[PDB]
Amino acid sequence: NDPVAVARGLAEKWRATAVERDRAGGSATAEREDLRASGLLSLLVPREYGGWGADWPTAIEVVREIAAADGSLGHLFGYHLTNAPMIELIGSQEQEEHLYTQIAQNNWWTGNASSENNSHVLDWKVSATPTEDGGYVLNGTKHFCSGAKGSDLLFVFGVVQDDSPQQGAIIAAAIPTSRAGVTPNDDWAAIGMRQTDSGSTDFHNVKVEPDEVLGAPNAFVLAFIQSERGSLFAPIAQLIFANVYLGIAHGALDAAREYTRTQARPWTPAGIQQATEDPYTIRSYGEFTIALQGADAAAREAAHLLQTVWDKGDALTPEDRGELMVKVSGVKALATNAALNISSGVFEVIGARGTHPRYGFDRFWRNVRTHSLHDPVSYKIADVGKHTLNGQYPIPGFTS
């Protein structure tokens, strides 16, 4: 009924273990179970199929709530949300009905071992060999996945690399993570985003049934070229990422605020009497708040635009998609730079004693600093620039 309230409940529960979990790293097994039990995994699945049928702005509010409590869980959950929509972006009506129903009925976690955003297709590690029955066999190791480990349903891409008619095609499929031959490894380590389970997954002679293949061979690339509905992949993922960062930024700001009010001491050599009345501390909080004020407002407008474009279905035009991606690109930039600035900047007001690991105050920065590198913010900014000056739209792809 009120997924945001549910998210708030989880956030409250998770704040108590936030420091220890960041320190420990590894999979957040108990928290993934909390999410499973909450029902939120089917947030975006249509109510027709047992899901919550939430709109994009609402699902984003949930992501933000979770991200503020825990950057890793925010990304884990937010990215999970982007997987199933692929089914209606490039998959068939039959697949939509079947898989949406199973996901909501079974409260499935979804994961991906999908695109290699910065490799030419014939160099991708996971190959797809066509079989006589119209399916494929997957082989190879996807070195960077998102939530494969711990997932029930895995959205995987492979490239046909033999010399058949499908040579070079990206094959998208949704298969059970528990299928023999699929090995999601426990090898994720990073300065931040430590509990996102973003390690490697091995595929050893993994069969993909014809009916598990989403769209035609190379459907995603064909959709990108045409700015068809499948080209909504990037604006959706990018807007979710931007909101994860904004959530992390709010988490950092609120943690700092509580510390300034309760633990911080005034700088007595400056004659300050109360930490909360230091004029530079006051200015810093104003600046943090104002940076988020603009970033959040922009992000909210972008979600409404995404809702509009989404609701057009296959009637969307390349212009609709391009205008959306430009707006989202700007939000990704605003969120990246606000979150980095705030998550680092709050230390100035917290002070020396707050560097103790018991506070884990650097987890916010480490989390944003890590994920913000998924794709280069410099080209987000450039895409916006090319639109402003030249009226040009981003070239659709996995990150633009």
Add this chain to the structure above:
Amino acid sequence: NDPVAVARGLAEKWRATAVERDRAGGSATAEREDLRASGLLSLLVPREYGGWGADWPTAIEVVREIAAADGSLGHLFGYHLTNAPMIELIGSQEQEEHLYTQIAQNNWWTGNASSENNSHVLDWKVSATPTEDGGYVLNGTKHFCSGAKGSDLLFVFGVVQDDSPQQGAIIAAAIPTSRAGVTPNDDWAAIGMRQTDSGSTDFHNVKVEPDEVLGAPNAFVLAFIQSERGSLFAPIAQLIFANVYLGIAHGALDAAREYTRTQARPWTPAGIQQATEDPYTIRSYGEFTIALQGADAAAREAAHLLQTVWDKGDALTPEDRGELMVKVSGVKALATNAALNISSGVFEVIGARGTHPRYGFDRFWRNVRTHSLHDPVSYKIADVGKHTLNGQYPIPGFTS
């Protein structure tokens, strides 16, 4: 007799284990021994007493080289260098001859358990109780020390808090760290500066002998009020800190450069062929370099000014000290800002694979994010502003 070359040798040696040492934290036992063996501990001790007799600019270059290798070791060594000068600043010539000679001949580490920079004196934790023979007994626990643990000679402050004529005076002393009742604890933990040994030290009925008391009771406070030679305490320490930050920034920049050249991949969706030819990567390296170019140049000028004021001895004037502190305050701000900006910003050019803990790339940011909070940069900036607008000099103290 090229101490900088010796320091470069150590930096080389320390390279293979920089990541592991930051990860492990604790005390840098092996590296402290390397420094002991190198002879550098007596860098600023006059040649007449067995030391190198290096000037401030040279000593600072040594600190910078070490800080670039390892921020903790840079702080540890640089802060150690600031201890013995106290003997000249407020102690007698007899004490100079005695203590400088011991430090140099024994290759001693010096540590401190000195000022509580943000507490009124009657609230300081370490009390000093005068004794019949003209010495004192120390009691209490200094909660934040610098290299007390692992030191051979400890510079300690206590406050006279009994009803006596010396009531409220700060007593400075230099005692062997092994003096009965001194217990440097192994309780240092922080997000960065992990091997600086900055934990607490307990004093249980610790006797300070009459000849170990440096200057009259309250000598430092009296020297501050008059801008006497003792007031060089802050400009020395502050300039050292700024240069530790600059060293850390260079370390980060160099780590990034090597990674960009050898490991980074071009962003192929933008059509880039070589990571080293990306125009935004090039711009970022330019901005990092330029920020350090300005901060380093200002730092160098400040070191020359410190040398000039130092060389005046007791003839320095309050204006001399004031102009110096204003300059150093500016360097502290420049170094802080540059080091935070670079140590965070290099991630943008390194990219997602560089977030793996095996690279330890966040250690640079964690180190400067931590120490930069020692005293508030906002008041460094304000002190400069007050000089610029009003011609006012900073009020001399332990941090200004």
